[PDB]
Design a protein around this ligand. Structure first.
Ligand SMILES: *Cc1cc2c(cc1C)nc1c(=O)[nH]c(=O)nc-1n2C[C@H](O)[C@H](O)[C@H](O)COP(=O)(O)OP(=O)(O)OC[C@H]1O[C@@H](n2cnc3c(N)ncnc32)[C@H](O)[C@@H]1O
Ligand SMILES: *[C@@H]1O[C@H](CO)[C@@H](O[C@@H]2O[C@H](CO)[C@@H](O)[C@H](O)[C@H]2NC(C)=O)[C@H](O)[C@H]1NC(C)=O
Ligand SMILES: CC(C)=CCNc1ncnc2[nH]cnc12
Ligand SMILES: *[C@@H]1O[C@H](CO)[C@@H](O)[C@H](O)[C@H]1NC(C)=O
Ligand SMILES: *[C@@H]1O[C@H](CO)[C@@H](O)[C@H](O)[C@H]1NC(C)=O
Length: 499
């Protein structure tokens, strides 16, 4: 039962809290489906406080508290909880002012960011110094440590790889309470374990993120299809490596619209005008389509005098290689930061309607390219038909060559695989249960069809499921690494890997 001086010091300084207000805030997440109250919440003011907790945890025999690192609690199924344990309120690391938590290098080649920092702030501190990270998430209010413990994907990942592929080095406090600086050169076994590591090996206090010169603007396009074969062939053409080298597109994503909610979902993009919506709805009726697909792509560009006309010509050449329905190219032109933060607006709009802090039974997965047409038929044209869709259905290809298989993040074996993100929002408890059963049905459809998919952002509750997730050989490596960095099995228990 005794406490080390540094641990008891945190209680004394009002950093380690047990009050109902502190525990309740760290007991819910974005998912809004599961909840688990912690025994205590840590609000650290420095990384020494994280060393204190973790050294205490490693030195104290029979220590009973599990420890989680709450980024912004964007988790869907309690991955950031420490049931009857200690939740770290990471955001407290950036409360002071001195020293700054985000530092762009003097050479403009990278950005050092605190593990707790949010990407929108990383973007602002980078843009002030004329640079910006190269690989994003669709939504910017997530933590560096949180996205890096998953993968971090968006429409730039086909050409720059996920966020985990754009990290030069990190400062990690292991489950032993040891401060370790790691990279591909120094303690690479920890660096690889942590990236896509689901917070199992230690906490990321600093990450060195690759940057590129900041473009000023984004020419933003949406291309419409009624044929899945043409839509997927075009997303693959736009993202294909040209014989290490890529095409002109800075970002490529896509979306599916089911016939039943077509006009409403197109209008809810925040992209199409009512005149654009009417034309697409009419197109669907002419082709007798039960689904409509849209490619979403950008072309990043600088403030140059000729830039605008050069972009028009470059975009026109790219579009001429494509097979979208003639006359169904829709363009917008925005400032680069506005494109990157396009989702914050959706968060604000939904929150005031009371439609943001609702259950999110999201289904996110990686589907091998060879089975995407089967997934489209069984899911978009099958299971989802005749349902009212509240949310987005995002589908886009990724290049495996840009993913490091030695890292923890699990991906399909094929060269090309699609990110498939089914972002359902629940409208009622009976709608929640219906949505949770529908997600089980989609996964069952994939299993019965022999689709070798990988989930993303999901936590498995069975050992056999986590072994199948990583793959048996890659699983043994994840175990070896757990035994090295968290032998007491306390870190991020909400993943249900070792807890
Ligand atoms: C809510 C949401 C999430 C989201 C998204 C849009 C919204 C509205 N768009 C995404 C996208 O386009 N691409 C992508 O890859 N992910 C996207 N997400 C999911 C997001 O990555 C996850 O929610 C993720 O967990 C990041 O969120 P957060 O920063 O809020 O992290 P957490 O949920 O609290 O914790 C996740 C796990 O990681 C461990 N953790 C957290 N911080 C650290 C640090 N610094 N070091 C080590 N481990 C850490 C937690 O313990 C937990 O297990
Ligand atoms: C797409 O969905 C619409 C409904 O939003 C279908 O249009 C309806 O068709 C039914 C039966 O054929 C009629 O009873 C309704 O009066 C129609 N309602 C509207 C608002 O048009 C349409 O058939 C669907 N198309 C496909 C190809 O499935
Ligand atoms: C991988 C993942 C969860 C992407 C989410 N992307 C998103 N993309 C666009 N709008 C959104 N609203 C919520 N999430 C949105
Ligand atoms: C879901 O969010 C609502 C609104 O904040 C709240 O009533 C409820 O406790 C949440 N449920 C879970 C399981 O987090
Ligand atoms: C329109 O498509 C539907 C559903 O996909 C099919 O059942 C129907 O027979 C079609 N109509 C024609 C004229 O092909």
């Amino acid at each position: 039962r005794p406490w080390p001086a540094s641990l008891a010091a945190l209680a004394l300084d009002g950093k380690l809290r047990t009050d109902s207000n502190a525990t309740a805030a760290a007991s819910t997440d974005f998912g809004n489906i599961t909840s688990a109250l912690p025994a205590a919440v840590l609000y650290p003011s420095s990384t020494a406080d994280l060393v204190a907790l973790l050294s205490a945890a490693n030195s104290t025999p029979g220590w009973p508290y599990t420890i989680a690192f709450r980024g912004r609690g964007h988790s869907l199924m309690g991955q950031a909880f420490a049931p009857g344990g200690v939740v770290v309120n990471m955001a407290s690391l950036g409360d002071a002012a001195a020293p700054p938590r985000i530092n762009v290098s003097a050479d403009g080649r990278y950005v050092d960011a605190g593990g707790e920092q949010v990407w929108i702030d990383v973007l602002r501190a980078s843009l002030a110094r004329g640079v910006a990270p190269r690989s994003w998430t669709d939504y910017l209010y997530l933590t560096v440590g949180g996205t890096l413990s998953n993968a971090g994907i968006s429409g730039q990942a086909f050409r720059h790889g996920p966020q985990i592929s754009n990290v030069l080095e990190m400062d990690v406090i292991t489950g032993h309470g040891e401060m370790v600086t790691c990279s591909k050169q120094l303690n690479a076994d920890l660096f690889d374990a942590v990236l896509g590591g689901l917070g199992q090996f230690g906490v990321i206090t600093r990450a060195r993120i690759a940057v590129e010169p900041a473009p000023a603007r984004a020419r933003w396009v949406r291309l419409v299809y009624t044929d899945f074969a043409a839509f997927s062939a075009d997303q693959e053409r736009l993202t294909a490596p040209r014989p290490a080298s890529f095409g002109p597109m800075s970002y490529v994503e896509g979306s599916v619209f089911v016939n039943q909610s077509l006009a409403t979902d197109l209008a809810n993009t925040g992209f199409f005008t009512d005149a654009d919506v009417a034309r697409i709805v009419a197109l669907a009726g002419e082709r007798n389509a039960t689904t409509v697909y849209s490619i979403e792509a950008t072309l990043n560009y600088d403030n140059a005098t000729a830039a605008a006309a050069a972009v028009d010509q470059e975009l026109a050449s790219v579009l001429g290689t494509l097979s979208y329905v003639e006359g169904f190219a829709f363009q917008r032109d925005v400032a680069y930061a506005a494109f990157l933060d396009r989702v914050h607006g959706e968060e604000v709009a939904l929150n005031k309607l009371g439609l943001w802090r609702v259950p999110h039974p999201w289904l996110n997965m990686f589907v091998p390219r060879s089975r995407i047409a089967d997934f489209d038929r069984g899911v978009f044209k099958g299971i989802l038909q005749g349902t009212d869709i509240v949310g987005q259905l995002i589908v886009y290809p990724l290049n495996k060559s840009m993913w490091d298989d030695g890292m923890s993040a699990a991906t399909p074996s094929e060269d090309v695989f699609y990110a498939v993100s089914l972002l359902f929002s629940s409208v009622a408890p009976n709608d929640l249960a219906r949505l949770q059963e529908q997600n089980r049905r989609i996964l069952r459809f994939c299993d019965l069809a022999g689709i070798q998919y990988k989930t993303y952002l999901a936590r498995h509750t069975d050992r056999s499921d986590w072994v199948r997730h990583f793959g048996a050989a890659k699983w043994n490596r994840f175990v070896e690494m757990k035994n090295k960095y968290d032998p007491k099995r306390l870190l991020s228990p909400g993943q249900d890997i070792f807890n």
